[PDB]
Amino acid sequence: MREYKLVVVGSGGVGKSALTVQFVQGIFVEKYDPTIEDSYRKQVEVDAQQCMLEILDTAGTEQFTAMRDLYMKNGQGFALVYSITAQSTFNDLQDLREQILRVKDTDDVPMILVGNKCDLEDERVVGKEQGQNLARQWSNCAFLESSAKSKINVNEIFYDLVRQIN
Ligand SMILES: Nc1nc2c(ncn2[C@@H]2O[C@H](COP(=O)(O)OP(=O)(O)NP(=O)(O)O)[C@@H](O)[C@H]2O)c(=O)[nH]1
Ligand SMILES: [Mg+2]
């Protein structure tokens, strides 16, 4: 079966691990905090085509990891995750995307912008329109707001990222 190597990236605390585990295992991590940059596997069907996904849950950008350029070079698609409750995590993604494009030496990289923690509407600081315009600035319409906690758009992040690699 075709296998896709996906990479979830973003600043600390945005819910990279929570999204990955919710998608792959169907459970919410609550306060459990994985300390390994591990890979998580799930078979999916997207547009009537079967795919094995292997999803790498990376450390927050501000944390040490010597493997970063390896994952940026080798990953087939990237989920760039921020929290809607922290503008810094959103702005951080501009530099992050630039780093990925630099490592790959091309603009043509499957990517989805993900505003996580959308269940925290009362704590929102990043407007949905901000996310939409960032996507527009990137010339890539793939943008979702998600909640790992409430299971909103979690599967769709990965399905939509697969659509781009296909
Ligand atoms: N309300 C809410 N909380 C969330 C969501 N996702 C994650 N969290 C919470 O946010 C905290 C950090 O989540 P986690 O998945 O560990 O984030 P991370 O991006 O993997 N952090 P790190 O970069 O350090 O590995 C946890 O308390 C977690 O329960 C969400 O969609 N909604
Ligand atoms: Mg994590």
Curated annotation (Swiss-Prot):
Q: Under the GO molecular function aspect, what terms does this record hold?
A: G protein activity; GDP binding; GTP binding; GTPase activity; protein-containing complex binding
Residues binding GTP, per UniProt: 10-18, 57-61, 116-119, 147-149
Q: Which residues carry this modification: ADP-ribosylserine?
A: 39
Q: Which domain of life is it from?
A: Eukaryota
- What keywords appear on the UniProt entry? ADP-ribosylation, Cell junction, Cell membrane, Cytoplasm, GTP-binding, Hydrolase, Lipoprotein, Membrane, Methylation, Nucleotide-binding, Phosphoprotein, Prenylation
Cell inner membrane keyword on record: no
Q: How is its activity regulated?
A: Activated by guanine nucleotide-exchange factor (GEF) EPAC2 in a cAMP-dependent manner.
Q: Which PANTHER family does the UniProt entry name for this protein?
A: RAS, DI-RAS, AND RHEB FAMILY MEMBERS OF SMALL GTPASE SUPERFAMILY
- Family to which the UniProt record says this protein belongs: Belongs to the small GTPase superfamily. Ras family.
Protein name, per record: Ras-related protein Rap-1b
Native source organism of the sequence = Rattus norvegicus (Rat)
